[PDB]
Curated annotation (Swiss-Prot):
Assembly: Monomer.
Gene name for this UniProt entry: VIM-7
Catalytic activity: a beta-lactam + H2O = a substituted beta-amino acid
Chain sites annotated for binding Zn(2+) 1: H83, H85, H148
Native organism: Pseudomonas aeruginosa
One MF annotation (Gene Ontology) recorded for this entry: zinc ion binding
Name of the featured protein: Metallo-beta-lactamase VIM-7
Main location group: periplasm
Recorded superkingdom: Bacteria
Source taxonomy: Bacteria, Pseudomonadati, Pseudomonadota, Gammaproteobacteria, Pseudomonadales
Keyword Metal-binding belongs to the record: yes
Length: 227
C-alpha cells in the first residue's frame, strides 16, 4: 500500500500514515528519461506541523501543501531539509512563500548556495560535528557524519520511534548507491554505525527514496556501499 512511481502521476503527492502524528510524503520527479520517487516526513506538534524535506521541486511542493491541508488540515509552520540536493531543498522558495520558517544546518546552506540550489532561511546550530544531536519541536535532529553527502542529517521522532534516514539510508530493493558525486564512501559505514548505536529502539526506518522498513535497512545500506 506504500506509494511507488507506478501509482503517482508526477506533479502529485501522496501522504502515508506511519504512526501517531507522523506521515511520510511521497512524490515523483524525472531526470534524464528517468523517473524516481522521493520521501519526506510530516510530524505533528500540538496544532501545527513540522515538515521534513520538500517534495522535490516547486510544482510538487505546492501540491504537497495542498495535500497536507486536505488530509490533515493543520498548518506547516517550520521545515527541515536533510541535505543540499534538489530532492531536499527544491521547493524551499514555495515553503517560504507559504510562510513556513525553513531550516537546515549551516553547512547545508553553504553547499546549497555553492550548487545554485534553493537555500533554507535559517540555520540549525550545534550540528557542526559528527555525533551532534539537537531537539527541534517533536523530533531530534542528528548529524551522523558524511555519507550520501557531507551534510546529510537524520531525524528521529522519539515518541513513536520513527527514524527518518533520508538519502543516507537505502531501501531494501536497492543494490547500488545511486548518485555518489557528493558522497563520502569511506566514511559512510562509520556514519551508519553511529546511527545504529544512537537509535537502537527505532521501529520504522524511512529511506530518502523507496519503501520504509526497519533497522535492517541500516546494515543493508552499509552492504550496498561496499562496492
Ligand atoms: Zn542527495
Ligand atoms: Zn536523494
Amino acid at each position: 500500500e506504500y506509494p511507488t512511481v507506478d501509482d503517482i502521476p508526477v506533479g502529485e503527492v501522496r501522504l502515508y500514515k506511519i504512526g501517531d502524528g507522523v506521515w511520510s510524503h511521497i512524490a515523483t520527479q524525472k531526470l534524464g528519461d528517468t523517473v524516481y520517487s522521493s520521501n519526506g516526513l510530516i510530524v505533528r506538534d500540538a496544532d501545527e506541523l513540522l515538515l521534513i524535506d520538500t517534495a522535490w521541486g516547486a510544482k510538487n511542493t505546492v501540491a504537497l501543501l495542498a495535500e497536507i491541508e486536505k488530509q490533515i488540515g493543520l498548518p506547516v509552520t517550520r521545515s527541515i531539509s536533510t541535505h543540499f540536493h534538489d530532492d531536499r531543498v527544491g521547493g524551499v522558495d514555495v515553503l517560504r512563500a507559504a510562510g513556513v520558517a525553513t531550516y537546515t544546518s549551516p553547512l547545508t546552506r553553504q553547499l546549497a548556495e555553492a550548487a545554485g540550489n534553493e537555500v533554507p532561511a535559517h540555520s540549525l546550530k550545534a550540528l557542526s560535528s559528527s555525533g551532534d544531536v539537537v531537539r527541534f519541536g517533536p523530533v531530534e535532529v542528528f548529524y551522523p557524519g558524511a555519507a550520501h553527502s557531507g551534510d546529510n542529517l537524520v531525524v528521529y521522532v522519539p515518541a513513536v520511534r520513527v527514524l527518518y534516514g533520508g538519502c543516507a539510508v537505502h531501501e531494501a530493493s536497492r543494490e547500488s548507491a545511486g548518485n555518489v558525486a557528493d558522497a563520502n564512501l569511506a566514511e559512510w559505514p562509520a556514519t551508519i554505525k553511529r546511527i545504529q548505536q544512537r537509535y537502537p529502539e527505532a521501529e520504522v526506518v524511512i529511506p530518502g527514496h523507496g519503501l520504509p522498513g526497519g533497522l535492517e535497512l541500516l546494515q543493508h545500506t552499509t552492504n550496498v556501499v561496499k562496492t
